[PDB]
């Protein structure tokens, strides 16, 4: 059953994944908890592998054309504006520049619109932020079960 | 005479350009001023055209290889993190997630490092944020000289 689009789902899963990870750090009898947390890291590892398999498989489609090019155009505009904003000025300056550009008929920064670039290209990558966090999660789970022995 | 690298210069010029534009809006006898401002828009138009000519010419170099690929890797990481940060949570959440990623050995968002992607690809674009602002500047200059007639 396909409930929603994989693009919409991907971002939901990634976000949910991150806030769940943060919630686990707060949680950390300190053995039953770490066994539940290991199980969860394993679960997320499995789902993530499937996410990757899915996007890796959906790379054979030729389709869209102008959309891929439109995303490049947006990426250029966003990179220019973002880089300037992140390396120059204070809040007042950043605001005045946004206004200047809006008054000139130039949309402000909008990275969300570039989402397709990530889901299309992360599969060509060797490692990924999520893969890295999952490994870190695993190493966290391991160090916890080694230190905290409660299961009698 | 080449004083500095074109990449470093480009970003300086773009930024300087933007804050000069803002300073002009504040400025706006309202004829001598608009003639100085037109002249300036013409000047910047000329410099920008030369900037484009330069980067358009410097597109024949095969060189770097891994650097181009490294930028793609960074673009993926930055897009993931940025998009999540821009579509989810409050300040506290965004901060906790940054910490989570840092504690997991994942650098935070850094678009400045992707500067090469803009200077390499903006030349393939039909229109550009700067081109758009310059046109807007010109139209501003024009509407000012039409309304404010002082030169007797
Ligand atoms: Cl642009
Ligand atoms: Cl990534």
Automatic annotation (TrEMBL), chains A, B:
Signal peptide range: none
Residues of the Duffy-binding-like domain: 9-151
Protein name as catalogued: PfEMP1 variant 2 of strain MC
Species per Swiss-Prot/TrEMBL record: Plasmodium falciparum
Organism placement in taxonomy: Eukaryota, Sar, Alveolata, Apicomplexa, Aconoidasida
Gene name of the encoded protein: MCvar-2 PfEMP1
Range covered out of full length: 577 to 742 of 1729
